[PDB]
Structures are given as C-alpha cells and as structure tokens.
A paper describes a structure:
NIT-2 NLS (915TISSKRQRRHSKS927) and PAC-3 NLS (281FDARKRQFDDLNDFFGSVKRRQIN304) peptides, corresponding to regions of N. crassa NIT-2 and PAC-3 transcription factors, were cocrystallized with N-terminally truncated M. musculus Impα lacking residues 1–69, variant α2 (MmImpα, UniProtKB: P52293).
Electron density is also present for six peptide residues (918SKRQRR923) at the minor NLS-binding site, bound at the positions P0′-P5′ of the MmImpα. While NIT-2 NLS interacts with N283 and G281 at position P3′ and with E354 N319 and R315 at position P4′ from MmImpα, no important interaction is observed between the NIT-2 NLS side-chain at positions P3′ and P4′ and NcImpα. The presence of additional interactions of NIT-2-NLS with MmImpα compared to NcImpα, particularly at positions P3′ and P4′, may explain the higher affinity of this peptide to MmImpα.
Residue numbers in the entry:
A (entry chain B): 72 to 497
B (entry chain C): 918 to 923
C (entry chain A): 919 to 923
The structure:
C-alpha cells in the first residue's frame, strides 16, 4: 500500500491537493524514512517536501497526517546537522511545540521525539527550542501525581528529550531553563524504569559538567544520595552516567565533594575500581584522582575505606588510560596528604608499580610520576628516612629509570630526573 | 544524541 | 588541584 514508494510518487501525492492522497503519500514517506539502511533523507529534502510536512502538522481535523508528517520530520531531524537544519528552517519548531498539546498521546509523543532530535543537534538549536517555549508544555506532560500512570515509551521519550535540553556546552543551557527543569529531573531520577533512570542520570551528568555554580544547582536539589544509590545499580547503562555525574561533582568545591563522600559513594569504589568495563575503571579512577585532590580529611576517608590498595592495583595493572588516572590520583594524594598518609601509601606498595610506569612513552605520565616521587621524598625528609626510600626505589629498578630519564626529550622531565638523582642518589 | 524512529 | 572533564 504505502510500502516502497519512489520519492517521485511521494511528491505526486503530496502535491495533489487531495488530503487523503497526501495522507497516503506522507505515510509512504514516513516508511521510507524509517528504514535502517540509508534512509533517503537528502532525496526527501531535495524534493522540497519539508514545508508540506510542516503544514500537515497543523491539520487538526486529520490527526493521521499530523502523526505521519511528525514521524517523517522526526526522522529527517535524526540525521546530520544540515538535515536537522532543513527541518528547523521549514518552521517545524513552533509547529511541534503546538503539537505537544494534542489530545492524541501518540502525536504529542512524536512531537516530543522530534524536539529532542532538534534540541539534540547542538547548543544553538537547543536554545532555539527553549526560546520558542518548549519547556513549559513538555513539563506539563509530566505534571501527574505518579509518573507510573504514564505509558512507558511515552515517559522514556520525554525523559530523553529533557536530557537533550540539558546537554551540550559553549554555551551550557540557560540557567533559568535548568532551574525550571531540575525538579522534574529529580522526580525522574527516582522513577523505577531503568531507561528513564539512565537518561535522567545522563541529564544530571550534563548539568554537572561545568563550573562550580552549575554543580551547586544540582547538588542543592539533594540528588547525590540517589546518584550514589544508582552508582550501585546492576545495569551498566545506569552506572555509567551515574558515575560520570558523581565524577563531575567531585571536580567542584571541597564542600560539594564532601557531599559525595557523606552519601556513601566511597563504599562502591572497590567494585568500580575492579569493574570489568574498562571505561568504568577509568572514570572511577579519575573520580578518585579528584577526591585525593581534596582535603586531608577527605584523603583520610579514602584511606579508611580501604581504597589505597585498590589504587595500587589499578596502577599495577589496568589499561593505560586508567593507569594514568591512577598516577594522577597518587600525585594528588602525595601533594595534599599528611606525612602519615604518605607513609601509609608506601606501605601499601605504591613504589614498585609507580616505578614500572616510568617505562611509559607518555611524557605527561612521566611528569606526574616524578612529581609523586618528589612528594614522597619530601615526606621522607621530614622523617629522616630518605635513604630507606632510595633503596626501595633502587631495588625495584626505579633508579635505573630515573637515571635514564635525565636523558629525555622534554626538559622538565630531564630536570626533575637529575634533581632526584642529585639529592637522593648521590 | 539523535534517535531515528523504527 | 582538581582536573575538570
């Protein structure tokens, strides 16, 4: 019936001035644009059909052609930036926002979907969707006493479109738009559907990726305990954005970091730092590196939770980018820690795996490690035990590599190298 | 970031 | 000090 029309036939039906003929041709376009392999988006655009689809969105007496054109335009907007731009250039944004009030749930859902693709293109179209007034009718669709009464796919699409309004930077979303959205986001973050939970976590992770004032807006809504709970979920698609959000938060102030610790996050890190998915291990070790960049009482919590042996483990064996985050975690720890905390680090076995990574070709991890070694020597100076540490570095092959590195391309590596040799390996 | 329907 | 993402 409407399966496998040519673009030419679709144009012929849409141009016919027969509403039923246009309905059939629009559904045929929708089916073309729904195929997985190379949907002919550019052919449909080039045929001039977008203005016709956009005007079909306004045909209140023919709800099927509203749906079919909404779906067709949704799938054009799912393409490249240029393809999304063609949809926007045709006036689709206010027409889709009007459709959010449709009494037909499947049509308002399709308009939700299309706006998420438009907003998802980037900051400018995101902000353009916001300027046309999308946030109020979107949030009104969720203004029910219990989210559980909404259809499952409908709630998932709303959550995802809201997360695209929270997404992207340069610039970040408008402050007042974020404040308007956050209470609904908090509510979606406590819903029981794993996809809603994943996309809510993604939205929170976007909002916390920025300056401390952005983080504070989120942290002040009291969501950190729920994020920490989600950090322990069995579903990787929930854990991943929950961990990104938690990691983003601990790039903030010491006080924002303390809320993550107060909520119990560190008890999850034995699992996260040994997680089979290397991206989780990396994100978790980066998070740890920013926590060890904190106050001594926060470093002490890392100690109390037994997490220093887990950092030794990741330093000893992990994919290289995780190992580099572990090196950063160690230099931050030795930079801000007490003498006792640094002594404890050595007793846990940090020295040998630290030395082994001096074989890495990455110039910055060598700098990070040399700094850590200098920081540890400075603690051993305060104890008169430099010699015991030099022997430790020498027995594990480390002095061989610190002596090699004084003939290194980067001048700051060469300098840090010879300084270590002069003062501690005379 | 973007989702094609069906 | 902290490292942003």
């Amino acid at each position: 019936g409407t399966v496998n029309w040519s673009v030419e036939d679709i144009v012929k039906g849409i141009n016919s001035n027969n509403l039923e003929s246009q309905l059939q041709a629009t559904q045929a376009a929708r089916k073309l644009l729904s195929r997985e392999k190379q949907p002919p988006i550019d052919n449909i655009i080039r045929a001039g059909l977008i203005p016709k689809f956009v005007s079909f969105l306004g045909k209140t007496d023919c709800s099927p052609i509203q749906f079919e054109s909404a779906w067709a335009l949704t799938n054009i907007a799912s393409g490249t930036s240029e393809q999304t731009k063609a949809v926007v250039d045709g006036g689709a944004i206010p027409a889709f926002i009007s459709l959010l009030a449709s009494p037909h749930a499947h049509i308002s859902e399709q308009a939700v979907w299309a706006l998420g693709n438009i907003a998802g293109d980037g900051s400018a179209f995101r902000d353009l969707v916001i300027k046309h007034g999308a946030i109020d009718p979107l949030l009104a669709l969720l203004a029910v006493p219990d989210l559980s009464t909404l259809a499952c796919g409908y709630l998932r699409n709303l959550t995802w479109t809201l997360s695209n309004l929270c997404r992207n930077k340069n610039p970040a979303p408008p402050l007042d738009a974020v404040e308007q959205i956050l209470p609904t986001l908090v509510r979606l973050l406590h819903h029981n559907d794993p996809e809603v939970l994943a996309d809510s976590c993604w939205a929170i992770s976007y909002l916390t990726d920025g300056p401390n004032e952005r983080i504070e807006m989120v942290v002040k809504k009291g969501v950190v305990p729920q994020l920490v709970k989600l950090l322990g979920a069995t579903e990787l698609p929930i854990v991943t954005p929950a961990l990104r959000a938690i990691g983003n938060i601990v790039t903030g102030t010491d006080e924002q970091t303390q809320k993550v610790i107060d909520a119990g996050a560190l008890a999850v890190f034995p699992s996260l730092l040994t997680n089979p998915k290397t991206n989780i291990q990396k994100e978790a070790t980066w998070t740890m590196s920013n926590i060890t960049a904190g106050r001594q009482d926060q470093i002490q919590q890392v100690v109390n939770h037994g997490l220093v042996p887990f950092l030794v483990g990741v330093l000893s064996k992990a994919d290289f980018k995780t190992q580099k985050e572990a090196a950063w975690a160690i230099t931050n720890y030795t930079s801000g820690g007490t003498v006792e905390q640094i002594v404890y680090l050595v007793h846990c076995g940090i020295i040998e795996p630290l030395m082994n990574l001096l074989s890495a070709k990455d110039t910055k991890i060598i700098q990070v490690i040399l700094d850590a070694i200098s920081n540890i020597f400075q603690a051993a100076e305060k104890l008169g035990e430099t010699e015991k540490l030099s022997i430790m570095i020498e027995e594990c092959g480390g002095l061989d590599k610190i002596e090699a590195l004084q003939r290194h391309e980067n001048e700051s590596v060469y300098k840090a190298s010879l300084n270590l040799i002069e003062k501690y390996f005379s | 970031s973007k989702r094609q329907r069906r």
